[PDB]
Design a protein around this ligand. Structure first.
Ligand SMILES: [Hg+2]
Ligand SMILES: [Hg+2]
Ligand SMILES: [Mg+2]
Length: 307
């Protein structure tokens, strides 16, 4: 039995999201995708800080080679933020590229570096809905030439990403599809192909929607279940295998990242935003951050964006 601990020091988030563990500094970064804020937590020293901007944000990833610089999303722009990690505002903002300059009602959502340091991220309608709503999103990667490439389209809610330990597969979540997809990934050309469902929620009586995900060193996926009050562990060796379920007190679990000095603590974000048609009463929906220990696996440190 794992132990789930609420991290009291951190408070409650409207939509806590995009956790990233920087192993060199033993620091957890994450966002609130509605409150327009970035967050830094240093567990060993019990230090917490935040930063404010005036656009919607969805990820924050340290830039390789440049301490104090971070690649972030600002609505539809991918930008570099220079930040001292403690002041309430960045020192400077440099825009890299607007991925969808003429689609005014879209925003970036989940994003992550692949193991080579390429940023992958997807867009969605700002007013996307569950279970049905506008489907306007696409999946991109950003090349070290600051030019974007599109890999998938017709995405409702661009969400969790992960890659296999051998760089042969990519895993991807469009929350609106209520499944986890797998793709063949060609690291040489950064092309994906052969889209196939890996895990379908309806086949296993799993409530809610897949949101963020990460992979452990045994190659298993850990998937946050928004409106399922849980994280699930699924196999990548064989389709449609549910390995384990860990209940999280917050119903709107949003994402996951391994961290801690041995990479065997799982940090879990959630959302306190109370939605129309929730399966959960308001008193339950808080938006805390959790630490899960005793899972018996390790994960990997967060990869920096090379850019
Ligand atoms: Hg910040
Ligand atoms: Hg910041
Ligand atoms: Mg998400």
């Amino acid at each position: 039995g794992p132990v789930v601990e609420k991290i009291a020091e951190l408070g409650k988030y409207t939509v806590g999201e995009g956790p990233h563990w920087d192993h060199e500094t033993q620091t957890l970064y994450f966002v609130d995708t509605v409150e327009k804020t970035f967050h830094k937590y240093v567990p060993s020293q019990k230090k917490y800080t935040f930063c404010k901007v005036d656009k919607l944000v969805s990820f924050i990833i340290p830039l390789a080679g440049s301490p104090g610089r971070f690649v972030v999303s600002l609505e539809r722009e991918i930008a570099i933020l220079t930040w001292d990690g403690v002041s309430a505002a960045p020192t400077s903002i440099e825009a890299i590229v607007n991925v969808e300059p003429h689609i005014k009602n879209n925003r970036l959502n989940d994003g992550k570096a692949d193991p080579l340091g390429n940023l992958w991220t997807g867009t969605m309608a700002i007013d996307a809905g569950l279970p049905i709503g506008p489907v306007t999103g696409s999946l991109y990667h950003l090349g070290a030439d600051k030019k974007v490439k599109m890999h998938e389209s017709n995405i409702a809610i661009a969400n969790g990403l992960a890659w296999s330990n051998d760089l042969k597969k990519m895993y991807y979540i469009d929350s609106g599809k209520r499944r986890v997809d797998e793709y063949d990934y060609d690291a040489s050309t950064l092309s994906i192909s052969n889209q196939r469902p890996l895990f379908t929620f309806e086949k296993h009586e799993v409530p809610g929607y897949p949101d963020g995900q990460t992979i452990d060193e045994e190659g298993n996926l850990w998937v946050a279940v928004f409106q399922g009050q849980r994280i699930i562990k699924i196999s990548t060796q064989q389709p449609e295998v549910l390995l384990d379920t860990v209940k999280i007190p917050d119903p709107q679990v949003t994402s996951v990242a391994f961290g801690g000095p041995n990479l065997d603590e799982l940090y879990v974000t959630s959302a306190g935003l109370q939605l129309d048609d929730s399966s959960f009463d308001k008193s339950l929906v808080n938006g805390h951050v959790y630490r899960v220990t005793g899972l018996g696996v390790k994960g990997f440190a967060g990869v920096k964006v090379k850019l």
